């Protein structure tokens, strides 16, 4: 300490467990030196964050760390060292829904299979949205299958608030296919922007393709705003086709809430396959949250 700051590196840990890097997949597949079990670690740089970016990152990790649901990838722990934050998540051995969709090689899924997966995604999102939390990454690449076939929404991507410009930017660089009309017009990100993205995923499960595609980023934006997409096979029920259309309403407030999706009979009847009576009572009836504290 003789300057023109030593001791300002963040050190945080909760356990002695050590992880060996296996492969990049800012995500790394690792193996525990304790018992060889595999996990995914997401590395986030912290040293070059402003004071505000750090307080928000902290608040996001705390939310990640407290999320527990059978259809959300289980957080294990986090640690900080060497100017980075590392978040340790369970590894879903079945891989992501994006690969599962391509594995079909054009063979449409059975409607029962679609809806059994979809209900699980909805249960996950209900849990997140009930707490007034957004999820910036409802995408097939971020929904996974466990070894026993359970669908899990990736925990990474939950957010306490989102900037419409930043999300638009992230999309022009990463994946643009889940952009909602409002984000395309630089209007505020909201819970129904998540519902749009959920719709894109359902559409992918119904058709094996993205709903909105175009030869340029600027024209993809215009096609999303127009709300015009190739219809789902009429082989699927009117209930399912009807839902798809509701999820792609242009005005966010015209899209159904996730509660509203789950109360639809053809979906409601499946919930008991995935939640116990106690969790159903807690999730749907008893535990209430509000934008008032
Ligand atoms: Cl199938
Ligand atoms: Cl995750
Ligand atoms: Cl609206
Ligand atoms: Cl909602």
Residue numbers in the entry: -20 to -17, -10 to 10, 17 to 284
The paper states:
Eleven NIMA-related protein kinases (NEKs) are expressed in humans. At the protein level, it has been shown that NEK1 stabilizes the complex between ATR (ATM and Rad3-related) and ATRIP (ATR interacting protein) through phosphorylation, priming this complex for Chk1 phosphorylation. In this work we report the structure of the human NEK1 kinase domain in its apo form and in complex with an ATP-mimetic inhibitor.
A T162A construct spanning aa 1–328, with an N-terminal His tag, was the only one rendering diffracting crystals. All crystals grew from related conditions containing polyethylene glycol, and all belonged to the same crystal form. These crystals allowed the NEK1 kinase domain structure to be determined to a resolution of 1.9 Å (with inhibitor 1) or 2.1 Å (apo). Following building of the NEK1 model, residues 1 to 284 of NEK1 were resolved in the electron density with the exception of residues 11–16 from the kinase domain’s glycine-rich loop. Contrary to what would be expected in an active kinase, the NEK1 activation loop formed an α-helix of three turns in length. However, it is also possible that this conformation is close to that required for auto-activation. It would only require movement of the loops between Gly165-Tyr169 and Gly148-Leu153 to position T162 for autophosphorylation in cis.
